[PDB]
Symmetry: D2
Subunit: 375 residues, 4 copies
């Protein structure tokens, strides 16, 4: 049990602020167009970073150490709920966090400032590889980068690429980040159209002998895959909060259809009653896992296993809820116009984002063994 | 068990003929374009009705009484397998059959001839209603039709609409079919874009006081909903054969990826091994249900329950196979380019076509009671 | 997320006290014998009510109004975990609570005192009917009871039966409770041996014209089905806490087998890894639902829907975990000796106790509609 | 589709003969007692081998080469259906077949004769090992056997043990079978009580330096694990036919309860209607897989994959049907008296017998790869 009652006043006010923003901009007509444009207007994105977050650290580190993850989760779940869509916000929050972790204050200052002044980021994160094999090597007097990055959000048009690479230019192979201008010769972007999550266009980006300057390398407090890997767990919480939100939007449509429509009403049908309770059980479980993992961080008691179990369960559960919602709306609602069919497609995509189910099993099983040995 | 071995030589030759046709036309490049055009070229459709069906009654009644349903199923399953797509063929076969049942030979002769000469039908079937309330009534010296038909395949552009209606023009409400020219005033078509099955574009069609002539009414051997309802069961067999075929195509891609790719090979992974066996079990079951229901008809021993159990199981099973195939292909393959993601969308649509799962439960449970009382 | 860290110190000490008691008495050898005797020894039951509950209201109302339900849940989950069995404790707690609700202090005082002095209750609750039709009627100068009660825990040997009945002895049919001595003529008990939950033997009890005295009727603050129905929701929380505990015991055996045994170790098997994570996800969800529903009560913010969703999910989830544990232990462990096979049987029984899944759907769907209208 | 219509007259007559035998002996009262005695009376077992099998090779090789497997399947499915129990017959049929394969005619003649004259076998098959490590070695002038066999049907009391072992007495480790008298010193049997399948009592048998004579070694046409492994696939078909039969018995009780009882009738309940159709779909699939695998053998076109897919699907499906039947019968029927709860327990056991689900995945995945490469 974790619903409105049970949040603090401060947390509830945050929701109020986010809900007033979402309702204002995320109309069905607006969202339909923005899905088509694969992106949000300057005004909408700027209004998001201008939001009154009620003192929570949502786009800044309130406590000067970490963000407030539960707060971030409430923001993402609510915007995903109102919009019924995959929004760019969670991807910005993670990219911001990752940049801060690996680069000096002087290096990140320009980018943070741009984000606060426009609500957009001038760089795109490029980490995943097809199968890590992206290298930087010295030829003579030059540093040259070779590799291929996959699933690069906004890879096609981003002004710059924040690229993870093995640096080999040292005497006798280490983890490294490079902020590479998209204008450097040898960078090729190949847009990948996915069946869902239209507003988060990705690309495959190939680096073919790209000259990189030393000043481009991130010189930060954090180092190594270890640090990156921790940061990507936040990405899983974000993704699950989005899945929960969208799933919740599908459930609202199902319920509204069920009471409204008649076939006496469709909601007095045993089949529909069970589907409804089945869906509310899944939503309850999703929310409990997402909120629990998030509140652990904020206590300073994060466990890897919580995040792994959450990621294993929620996107698949979200997809099943959205699918059940389609079944309740009947033949219409397999129509592209209906947001439930977009939601269903979005949620299916969450089963690939930020590590698959199969990867969560590999991460979780030793932690489970460890947990039962330890008790 | 029902695979190649186990078919007669005649049945196997039929497959050979269909497979040679499919391979010839249904290239990935061709299918991609035809998905985009929402329809097949004249040459391809004409080549289908020109096919050597090895003496089976596929587009004609070989035995002069019925079509050869198992043969039709092999044709539809194979074309769906090769194409990885929802093809128009099964919808033509049913529309042809339904026309013959309800109209005189003189009435159907022009339409059959056009189909044999071009591979296309000049009419579209309009039966489903939103919730039957489509009426024909007399005003004075005129017959006037009012109603709304839903999910009308090619409703938007078809030259004529074969419409099911309550005729009230008799003295003291009966089932009736009307072949209405699309040019009759008061006909409004509203295209419905679905998330899958692009080549089978549907429309909502409203009839607003449309003047219908007496010569348009179908005067046939068959009469009443009873007859129509029987015919629509064939439509369920067709739809399930399509689901099986497409599902089978998804499985082939999964297997080819699994052996080819490596992550040593991806097919030596316990997770993938189980998914594979799980998928082959579902395909085995689907095929057994579809082939069994079809062979029952051809024996003259059709049972309603067979068709209901088949329709309950297969589209959902097909969707799960296609989804498992996506999961095996990984992140790519949630990409629109990959046919597995279209297949997944197609198969989800089969859960609405020709009666839902929930409708099959309502049909099947009394037949089950009857079956266990009877033994 | 709700595990040891996250409980207060007070809650943790309670667990320590309960765990020291459980470990002391509930040995495999002891439990095996007690399963066989279908009951616990006087010493064990007395030690339970003598337990230091760390000031929580577990067998008494600390706050003078209600019990402390979350505390009760921790007690029941832990004893079920250590024992791997269905224990009588939760059934006593509910029977105690129900007695207090419907009877005067003078009426309940003897029974409470006996329970505190011996750890046993001298009465058995008789409410469920086969399908409410148990009546009390006046003949002449007598009051006569007729009806049949089902699933009466310890119905066969309990000294007295607390019976729910329609009283018709008033002038112009109302809810009523009667504390009937088992020695009253016309009471017939029929023991029902179940496949699981051996220590909670039930009976069908028929009342055939039993003379009941007026002094036997419960004269309490609480009245009507409404009040009874609320009390039975506590019974659902108790039952789910037991299911969670037993399921948790099955998981521990699975994990211990997996690491210990080898087939290199059985836990490095992809199949086992996934089963393990799947099980830990279900346990996480169960615990979240049970703890959440319990903490709601203690806040004074109980919602019927929480208890309905919990009861819908947990016993079936518990059965699946226990079954997965059996599959991991292999062929042995379908052996009666192995506690995992008893646990599996116990948990299957929880799907009938305190209202079925199907009854939870009927309860939950209107509350869900209400919840989404209200927001 | 594979039901009564669809069998030949000969096959149908066989069923009639088996059904008349089953109905005659397998009364609920008789079965209840025989479950308690863990075995069938001499009269019942003798009547089985005296059955008129209508010329099929059920306990003999009609064609002089193989048994008639489909016929055997009909016999086992029908007896399991009528009895609602796990019967010894299928275990005898396999043991008979295995003996014939590995031993000379002179060696098997006494055992076949005893079986035909009494309906019982004087030996018990001992093959499975805990983890193959059972050896025969020479000490000086003696041959000595050491090993431990698991899950030995009737291991505790069988007059003789047919034991699989590595023979090392040759100069420079080979597969071998030994018919060992239970009276040989050093044989220890440990009865294992399982939660289901009472009539098929198993034991762990330890061989501690047992002197074996050379005349005890089976000298047969068939040799090696390869041959044994093929024979054990028949055991999987038998086990699945038993699972199907018992599952079918559970379904009949569910249906009879549903129409008979009322809660207007319980069968007009949407929840029950769906459970019913879900169950009949699973039974349809089970029967199709079992009958298909069996008919393949009889055609001489056995594929390993058919048997693997069948074994993967059917016992788990059978358990789900039996469980759904329990849920429909309600609270009673978790009672030991009700045969549905025994059936449920039996079917759960089939998930371990003759190779687990997890073992079928390992067997099936390469055959699937092979199958899709081959086409």
């Amino acid at each position: 049990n974790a619903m409105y009652d049970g949040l603090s006043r401060d947390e509830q006010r945050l929701l109020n602020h986010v809900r007033e923003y979402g309702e204002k901009y995320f109309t069905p007509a607006s969202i339909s167009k923005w899905r088509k444009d694969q992106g949000l207007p300057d005004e909408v994105v700027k209004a998001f970073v201008d939001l009154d977050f009620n003192g929570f650290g949502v786009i800044h580190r309130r406590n000067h150490r970490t963000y407030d993850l539960f707060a971030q989760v409430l923001v993402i779940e609510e915007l995903s709920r109102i919009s019924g869509a995959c929004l760019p916000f969670q991807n910005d929050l993670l990219q911001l966090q990752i940049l801060e972790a690996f680069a000096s204050s002087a290096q990140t200052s320009p980018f943070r400032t741009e984000y606060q002044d426009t609500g957009r980021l001038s760089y795109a994160l490029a980490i995943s590889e097809p199968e890590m094999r992206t290298h930087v090597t010295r030829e003579g007097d030059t540093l040259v980068m070779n590799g291929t990055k996959m699933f690069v959000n906004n890879g096609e048009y981003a002004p710059a690429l924040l690229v993870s690479a093995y640096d080999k230019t040292g005497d006798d192979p280490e983890f490294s980040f490079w902020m590479v201008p998209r204008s450097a010769a040898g960078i090729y972007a190949y847009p990948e159209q996915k069946i869902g999550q239209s507003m988060l266009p990705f690309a495959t980006v190939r680096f073919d002998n790209v000259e990189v300057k030393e000043s481009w390398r991130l010189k930060g407090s954090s180092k190594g895959f270890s640090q990156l890997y921790s940061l990507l767990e936040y990405g899983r919480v974000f993704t699950c909060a989005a899945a929960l939100g969208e799933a919740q939007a599908a459930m609202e449509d199902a319920v509204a259809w069920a009471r409204g429509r008649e076939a006496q009403r469709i909601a007095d049908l045993q089949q529909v009653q069970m589907k409804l309770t089945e869906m509310e059980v899944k939503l309850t479980n999703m929310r409990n896992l997402v909120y629990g993992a998030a509140r652990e961080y904020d206590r300073g008691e994060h466990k890897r296993l919580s995040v792994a179990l959450m990621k294993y369960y929620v996107p698949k559960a979200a997809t099943e809820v959205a699918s059940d919602a389609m079944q309740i709306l009947g033949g219409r609602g397999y129509i592209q116009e209906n947001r439930v069919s977009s939601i269903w497609q979005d949620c299916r995509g969450y089963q690939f984002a930020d590590g698959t189910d199969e990867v969560m099993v590999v991460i979780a099983a030793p932690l489970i063994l460890e947990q039962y040995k330890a008790s």
